[PDB]
Write a protein that binds this ligand. Sequence first.
Ligand SMILES: CSC[C@H]1O[C@@H](n2cnc3c(N)ncnc32)[C@H](O)[C@@H]1O
Ligand SMILES: CSC[C@H]1O[C@@H](n2cnc3c(N)ncnc32)[C@H](O)[C@@H]1O
Lengths: 345, 335
Amino acid sequence: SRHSTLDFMLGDGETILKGLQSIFQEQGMAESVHTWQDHGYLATYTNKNGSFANLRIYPHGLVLLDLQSYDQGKEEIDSILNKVEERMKELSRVKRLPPIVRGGAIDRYWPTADGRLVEYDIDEVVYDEDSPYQNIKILHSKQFGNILILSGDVNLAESDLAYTRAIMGSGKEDYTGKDVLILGGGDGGILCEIVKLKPKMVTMVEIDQMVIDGCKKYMRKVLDNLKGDCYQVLIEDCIPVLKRYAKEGREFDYVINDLTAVPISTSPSTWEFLRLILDLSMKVLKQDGKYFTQGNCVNLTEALSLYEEQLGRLYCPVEFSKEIVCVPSYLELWVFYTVWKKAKP
Amino acid sequence: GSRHSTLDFMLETILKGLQSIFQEQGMAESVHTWQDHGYLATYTNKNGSFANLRIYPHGLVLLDLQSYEEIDSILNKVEERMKERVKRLPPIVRGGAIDRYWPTADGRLVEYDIDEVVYDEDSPYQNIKILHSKQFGNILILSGDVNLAESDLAYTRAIMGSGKEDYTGKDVLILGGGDGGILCEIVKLKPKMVTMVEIDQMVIDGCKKYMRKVLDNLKGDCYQVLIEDCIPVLKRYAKEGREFDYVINDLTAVPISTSSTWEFLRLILDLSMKVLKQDGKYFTQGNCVNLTEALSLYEEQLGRLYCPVEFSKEIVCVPSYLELWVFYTVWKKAK
Ligand SMILES: CSC[C@H]1O[C@@H](n2cnc3c(N)ncnc32)[C@H](O)[C@@H]1O
Ligand SMILES: CSC[C@H]1O[C@@H](n2cnc3c(N)ncnc32)[C@H](O)[C@@H]1O
């Protein structure tokens, strides 16, 4: 469960192999050696306590060491690593990344949307449950506070006021006396920030009661009650609700799409589904209102282009703008869209 | 370099179930069995790649592969077969010509979107890297510590006191600041004078060329850059009784010395208060929010200067840092 690495960038393979072996030999470890017709050497060392090491010596001045614990055993590995560093100076760039914990009861590793390995300062699993719709985790970060992670995707931390600010239009909008629809938003951030501004009505449409309840319990920076003088939370799929509102001719001043990156469907195309949501949102948006949503990470330039393609395929002509926002817990810069109807004639 | 891929299952019959995948790729197997601690199977390939399959006796199976598409396919096969509680983190490149991995001040592993080494030289004072990030632009890294990226105007704003200060007609001293960000931002605000004291000509030269979001000239109407150690210069200004409306400490985390880490920081703070107007303010970058002991040891030094001071702090999100950072504002107590 703890995997430690040490990389040396140099450049004699055999001299290093022989020069390092007593470090392991003196720890009581068993050693086997694989040799290639110069693809170098692989040395494998086994310990009685269930830990092992691998020393890989490439033909051109690259030596990689891996130690894996069964994880006293941590100090033994750290000590070996320190010795190997000492010895390599005698035998003479070095990289010693933080060890990775493998199969930890607390999972600290939440790769970014663009596929980068990032480790978070998680000291506690606060909540980890499966609803009928998604896995819901809330993990405590020392710096970011509690972080909501839905199907393995970081959605929001208690530190992420910048997300909620950006998706409400970055302080440019007056919500006083306005009618607002929020799609998703199970954490309650947007809802609660808007209630503070004295709207006429905010309606939030969230499919998963378990996200509502977990965030009520654990994402605490109003909602003891799901209906108030100027808000209501509907626990349902936003699609039939969008349709029902269009059918009653209802129009909002603002529609804020705070759904998961992959909106939840109960039907047994990716882009088509986003377009549908868009189209349905435009149908309940006043001619002079605005629609806001989170876009995607700034580096996913193809996915942002295919998204903006869909903005051209709506029942009405629209215009849009975008802004790049730094959300603390995201560990990647994010794009946020503002969308509005083109003036009619 | 070598690419290291991992696959973890959180859950002998697993051993024999998976062995097949490696025999078919033509890999030679060696098994080690512990009496109580399970199995380690090592597999080698003629192309110089290898795999280790570690099977703990109670639920954990860890797979690692290393090579100079085949490995991807093996991992895909192992996932399918285990289906007959999974983590597959991005593969780590080891010994790569473009190094992507720059752990945080609190010792977390973080990979950056780095696609180019723009600059990597040793100066007489420190190693200087400028690396291209797709989202952060060029990132200045000094002695392996990310100092600033082109996306990091939040840093510069916070170290200038977060838009609360009026720089017009003012005298300013900057310590370090070799990337030129603070100087340039303050020059735009029309100060009386900005003096910047930066030890390392190579940081200035690197950042002029590569950190682009003036300084073609190191002197102007309302500014001068002194290429020297700021400690002798502070000592001279303190001796002269010279004073500034603002002193901005933009030094490296360990300030450079050409000849108790806390005593050195106390010295710099004490010299800086000495050259500071009674109604002026001192700004600096502090540390990572998680490093509560180092923050505490730092704030202990604030109580150890020639005069009483007060201070406040602000937590700031600097895009490229990948951790929250504390910035300090310090000023003298009245009377
Ligand atoms: C936390 S903000 C993201 C929220 O969007 C919600 N969500 C996803 N799909 C839908 C849907 N079709 N209708 C309503 N809410 C949804 C998720 O349950 C999550 O709470
Ligand atoms: C980029 S901001 C950090 C800057 O502080 C500079 N620096 C570090 N120590 C000193 C010192 N003693 N005097 C002046 N500048 C310094 C470094 O060379 C770097 O350019």
